[model samples]
Target: YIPEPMDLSLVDLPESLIQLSERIAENVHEVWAKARIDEGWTYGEKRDDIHKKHPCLVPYDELPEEEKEYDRNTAMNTIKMVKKLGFRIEKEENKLDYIPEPMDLSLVDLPESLIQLSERIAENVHEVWAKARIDEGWTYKHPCLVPYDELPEEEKEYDRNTAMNTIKMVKKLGFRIEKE
Candidate 1:
């Protein structure tokens, strides 16, 4: 078969990656050999798929130089394509931990309606805390059982602070609060 070669001169693989290609090429040949064997194919003097026989049905190391070249080219080209697609390839030991840069929510502007929404979030916060207290065997006789609006100013301040932080964090994470 006549082959049209791809121009991958733009890809410059690192020395480690070039070395990695040899292992990939060997596995490529091994995988193909396994597939052929599973289909009842065995080695023959020449190509003869009609009789389920092939010459390249042996281990990758024992393949003819020309046959091995085909696998090497395939492996190299695959690595090139991955780089062409703007993907990073790195070994586990060589990889660095990725941490997103810190963002400041103090300067970000939010909708006025979110202030009202924060009151709702504050009420929900109090409700959830109250429910957890009850679940943990706190009785309805507790002094904090009153509605969120009726809570003392100091208690409501804590809930309001929690709500404001929630709103700011949502904005920091690239989200918006809106009315339907």
Candidate 2:
């Protein structure tokens, strides 16, 4: 049957998510091949529907280029559909439950040159944290919901701590930070 698939060219999927599509493509081909096998369809170099012999009854990796395209298209389209529907497909390893232990930043010392930048970073950190909370349906207003500069010294200090630890941790990882 000639197919008319939806256009998903604008679905900008994450690079790593393409791996999931590849896996789905492989499984799609496997399921189709198994279906044919169960139906007494034998693999033949040529198609013979009357004799229940087909040419694509093989492993996905071994399928001919044109034949594999069918499974690939199916998988790619499925992924695009999910994205279009506002569904995320994160890898199991990327799940939130796999949080790493907090880093030991006690020994990290922030350079004096970064003191000013630390305040700026802390403001951004508060903004990002608030945005994430907002996205998760946290709508109730609290005293800390105010802008960083307007926050109580105690709240601002918490963000500064986060910013300081972040800088220290990055530097500890052997990366140099340069200010413009």
Candidate 3:
């Protein structure tokens, strides 16, 4: 299955913000593809390169003792956040499933501020992932990395920091991060 390109026109964004959004979208797509969550790949492929390449999907059962010190929910939420953006997965033969469609502002009458907020959230998720990886040495691999019941005491704090860092980065770029 071919993944559809994300459309930025759905939101009212500045040109610079749109460009950044597109870049983030591309990175997300690459992460999904390389993580093997996208179509035309196998679980084996996901497992084999999960550490060196993806590093994000290291399951609770597989995490090294040192890395186990991070938050499980934040990791899971990060995965969920990425999936929510637009990752497409294949289940059975030829069956294609995708994350929920992003809210279409054209259909609903949202205030301009709200519309701006929505775009900011999308941009922020991308920033968070990047900052976590660069600043905190967090990897954007697969969703299985931080499963529930396996999160350590310090993991949650790290996740929070990562989330906040992401918001800061996005805002510095002049967008407002929103939750929906």
Pick the TM-score winner.
2
Question: What lDDT score belongs to each candidate, Candidate 1 first?
Answer: 0.60, 0.58, 0.39
- Model 1 regions more than 4 Å off: 1-7, 93-180
**Cα error, candidate 2, residue 128 (Å):** 38
lDDT (Cα, tens digit) per residue for candidate 1, span 9-63: 7899888667666666665565566667778777777788689987766655566
Native-to-model Cα distance after best TM-score fit, residue 95 in candidate 3, in Å: 49
Off by over 4 Å in 2: 1-7, 93-180
User: If both were scored by lDDT, which would come out higher, candidate 1 or candidate 2?
Assistant: 1
lDDT of 3 by residue, 70-107 (tens): 33333334334433555321211111323312222133
Clashes per candidate (backbone, < 3 Å): 0, 0, 5
**Mind giving the per-residue lDDT tens digits that candidate 2 earns over 45-156?**
8999889987666655566688767656645654564455454454332322222233455787777865555566666556655666666666535456566667789878
Query: For residue 99, what is the lDDT in candidate 2?
Result: 22
Residue 20 local lDDT, model 1: 61
Clashing pairs in 3: 56-141, 57-142, 70-155, 71-155, 71-156
Where does model 3 exceed 4 Å of error? 1-18, 21-146
RMSD of each: 26.5, 19.8, 18.1
lDDT of 2 at 80: 61
